[PDB]
Design a protein around this ligand. Structure first.
Ligand code: GNP
Ligand code: MG
Ligand code: MG
Ligand code: MG
Ligand code: MG
Ligand code: MG
Length: 321
RNA sequence: UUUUGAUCAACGGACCAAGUUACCCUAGGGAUCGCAAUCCUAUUUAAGAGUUCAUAUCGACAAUAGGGUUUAA
């Protein structure tokens, strides 16, 4: 849902000398909102990504003025954010019936002025519909987010046995007895830092920006997880999780977030729970500023223990804001 | 006792005569492609730059098809 498109403005019609007058302005490119299903159409159908607008009509005998040209339109999903090639946000078609002048039609060719014709503007426009979920799930690889989403919903999420798996976020809506549906999306496990875009990087991290709230899975196996070389403590992971989010965007840290303990079934994990209870809250032997929302609940996937309790806490936060 | 006379130029030249008709009439006949000169475009060129985990090409200059313009009552 993060495609890209190129467009070209129509050319200006050439003027008719001997009092004929101005030529028509070139056609303009307006990205037009349509049914949200159109997103698949744009990226997949019409593989050629160049969209061109009709050039302005040339002046005709009897000193007819230009026809102003023929505009071209690009269907887009609702809620999409229109951004420039450099990443500048031109606009977002948040609601339907929303058109944006992404490209400018060529200035109408006027014989009296300096320029007889003028060519239409052309540019690369990035179009992305980063998942605007009610809340987002953020965790390290092998955290269990896919397993956690598997139990709450029936989305058959891909289970990441190894790191760098489940690259594409999977949107799952959680039903409640109150008949309220809350969308939860599971992204792939993130690496430490990633401010330099190491490994996976923060390219997929743009999706969380849209999400109103963040869900932090805390794998107890994560505590001192090998991570290949060094072994990282869970307390360290939380600090790094907060630190890396702040580096990518300050607002991300300020946004509401929740904590989700995972893999507490193991008796050794239960011993760690007291370590998790000890870590944070009371000052620890620290090894940037970090933020603790305190919305942490002890649960285990696979065994499906305590899952129902967490659901209530998530709903309370959503209802609050 | 030898000669001269025309924008008679409608130029084989009436000495000297314009409009108008739906108010009309008669006799009839009828019908009932080229060059150039720039400028746009489209396809094939690509000189170039390019490019970067549901992520890119555009495009000099040409070639070719169209549409204009200057170029001839
Ligand atoms: N003991 C235990 N094992 C679990 C639990 N949750 C997941 N696992 C195991 O850990 C494996 C790793 O996959 P998992 O962490 O679920 O995938 P993911 O959450 O999508 N990983 P990623 O963080 O990269 O997105 C699973 O296939 C499963 O065998 C849990 O609560 N307890
Ligand atoms: Mg005559
Ligand atoms: Mg004669
Ligand atoms: Mg003769
Ligand atoms: Mg009358
Ligand atoms: Mg009368």
């Amino acid at each position: 849902d993060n495609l890209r498109i190129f467009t070209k403005g129509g050319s200006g019609g050439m003027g008719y000398p001997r009092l004929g007058g101005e030529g028509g302005r070139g056609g303009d490119v307006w990205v037009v909102a349509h049914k949200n299903m159109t997103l698949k159409q744009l990226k997949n159908k019409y593989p050629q990504k160049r969209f061109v607008a009709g050039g302005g009509a040339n002046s005709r005998v009897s000193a007819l003025q230009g026809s102003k040209g023929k505009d071209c339109e690009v269907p887009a999903p609702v809620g999409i954010s229109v951004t420039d090639e450099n990443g500048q946000v031109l606009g977002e078609l948040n609601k339907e019936e929303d058109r944006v002048l992404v490209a400018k039609g060529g200035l109408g060719g006027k014989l009296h002025t300096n320029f007889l014709p003028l060519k239409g503007q052309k540019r690369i426009v990035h179009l992305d519909l980063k998942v605007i979920a009610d809340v987002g799930l953020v965790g390290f690889p092998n955290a269990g987010k896919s397993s956690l989403l598997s139990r709450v919903s029936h989305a058959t999420p891909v289970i990441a046995d190894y790191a760098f798996t489940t690259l594409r976020p999977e949107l799952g809506k959680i039903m409640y007895n109150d008949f309220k549906q809350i969308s939860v999306a599971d992204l792939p496990g993130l690496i430490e830092g990633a401010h330099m875009n190491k490994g996976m990087g923060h390219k997929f991290l743009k999706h969380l920006e849209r999400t109103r709230q963040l869900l932090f899975v805390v794998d107890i196996s994560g505590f001192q997880l090998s991570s290949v070389t060094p072994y990282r403590t869970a307390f360290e992971t939380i600090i790094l999780l907060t630190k890396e989010l702040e580096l990518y965007k300050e607002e991300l840290q300020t946004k509401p977030a929740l904590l989700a303990i995972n893999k507490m079934d193991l008796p050794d994990a239960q011993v760690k729970l007291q370590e998790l209870m000890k870590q944070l809250l009371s000052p620890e032997d620290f090894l940037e500023k970090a933020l603790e929302f305190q919305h942490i609940v002890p649960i285990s996937t696979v065994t499906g223990e305590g899952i129902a309790e967490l659901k209530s806490c998530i709903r309370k936060a959503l209802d609050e804001q």
